[PDB]
Amino acid sequence: FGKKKSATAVAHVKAGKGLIKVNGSPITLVEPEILRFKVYEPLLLVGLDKFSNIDIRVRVTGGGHVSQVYAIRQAIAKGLVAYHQKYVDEQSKNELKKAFTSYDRTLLIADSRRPEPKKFGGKGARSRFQKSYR
Amino acid sequence: LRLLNTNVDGNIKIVYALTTIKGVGRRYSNLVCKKADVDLHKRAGELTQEELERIVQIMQNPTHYKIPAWFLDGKDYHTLANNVESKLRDDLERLKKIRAHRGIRHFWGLRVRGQHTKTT
Amino acid sequence: VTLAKVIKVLGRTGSRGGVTQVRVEFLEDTSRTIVRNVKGPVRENDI
């Protein structure tokens, strides 16, 4: 349900079991790794109220790599708290939420940044080419 | 540590120092110095004398009179090596004669082709 | 930000006193705090 700086991650919500697959995999993998956490850290991040739950998982895809990674990010907890009451918490879903966003920036809504704009100049944007007429 | 003519190579892995084999290079190294049944892995001063004999076979017998592996109207092709420069002169010579706006240009000293030379 | 006054605290009961600061040949604003030498308004500061 959440897109990230030219990327976009979709949310799956309806109670089930373990193995929450991202794309069509398993937030065990998610191999653009290094910072492979911050993904498993939404679920881990559940460290504030829940321990893992027993629910669902969906696929992302847009822009490029770390973009996507950051997208699947919100994607998750931006879908634990899912309305609710069949998804979030049948009452006071600020349970997670305010907790899963008292140290967040992914589920903590998205960033007002997004690529565009250049210039009749050099590279463009602001970096206008280097000229030194004599 | 001393193959093909004056070529005196060594110290630097099989099929790698056989580039410093004036004439021999990045694929000759492999293909040649490989079809030798030679463990490309193998290195410098270490190498089967049966190798080198044969590395001078394939990689200097195919990579010489052959490129026909190592055994059996020939034509046919061939490379060079430490007999390179010499032949270079040879052909820049085949040119240095009948005259070529891009040949006599080797003698004169202009770059051979394209070359919008009026700066570098 | 020429360190203002040095109102310490009694005798041997102060890891260090405080000191306001602003600037003369540049800035100018209220302050205090981080530094524990022992200079004076003879000495000065920067902004």
Binding site: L19, K21, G24, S25, P26, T28, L29, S52 | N30, L31 | -
Partner: protein
Amino acid sequence: MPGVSVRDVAAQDFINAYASFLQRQGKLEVPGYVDIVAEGWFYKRAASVARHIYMRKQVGSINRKVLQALEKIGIVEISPKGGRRISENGQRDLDRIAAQTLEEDE
């Protein structure tokens, strides 16, 4: 939480080959042979066109029929699509080796 099925990432390709041109036989009678690049090598390429089940069956000239070996064994069909479906021995012959790899991590 969790698994892979046909998945399991990379080594799961450093497998199908690790157990192709190892548990050989074969098709890869590839005559392109030595001249072309690299190393060992190149059942890896195949354990590539392999994981190429996830796709084309629903998404150079060594490649140009590096397919021809897969389609002579480990799936890879003429695909009415226009490419290659993971044939009989399906996300199966593969899915298996994938399993083997799975329990093979430990």
